[PDB]
Amino acid sequence: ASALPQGNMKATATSEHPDVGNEGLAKFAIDGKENTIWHTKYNPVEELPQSITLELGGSYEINKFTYLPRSGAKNGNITKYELHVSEDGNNFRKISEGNWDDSGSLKTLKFNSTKATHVKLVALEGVGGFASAAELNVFA
Ligand SMILES: CC(=O)N[C@@H]1[C@@H](O)[C@@H](O)[C@@H](CO)O[C@H]1O
Ligand SMILES: [Ca+2]
Ligand code: NA
């Protein structure tokens, strides 16, 4: 399994900060740039839980998902997550959940191959009460 092409995806999120340079549009989570990040909207803060959804560009049999946090800082580093999948873009179901440390390290989810047109990362808890993500990848 290899990473699906990010340019064939579309990212949307429940909350996103406007483009203020390197943050925080949902689409910055899939631009192949470690220095740009999705960040939940702040001023005013939109409280967790918040989610980011990747429309994959097709119906794929996916087996791995990676979460690269922002670097240089910690706000929004996700520490309690769910990963959900959908086959229709509306009906979602949980396939992964757990805890990550607030460190900058790549966080990797592996799961049984399952069919998906969309993947949704739910940030339940995150540093500062924000959620952010530098790069998200999905493997099929
Ligand atoms: C470098 C850094 O930490 N930037 C953060 C920004 O990403 C956001 O989390 C904001 C929340 O108000 O705080 C800023 O200081
Ligand atoms: Ca990025
Ligand atoms: Na709690």
From TrEMBL:
Beta-D-galactose binds at residues 23, 70, 75. Ca(2+) 2 binds at residues 28, 31, 33, 36, 134-135. N-acetyl-alpha-D-galactosamine binds at residues 23, 70, 75. N-acetyl-D-galactosamine binds at residues 23, 39, 70, 75. Signal peptide: none annotated. Residues 3-140 form the F5/8 type C domain. This is Probable alpha-N-acetylglucosaminidase. It comes from Clostridium perfringens (strain 13 / Type A).
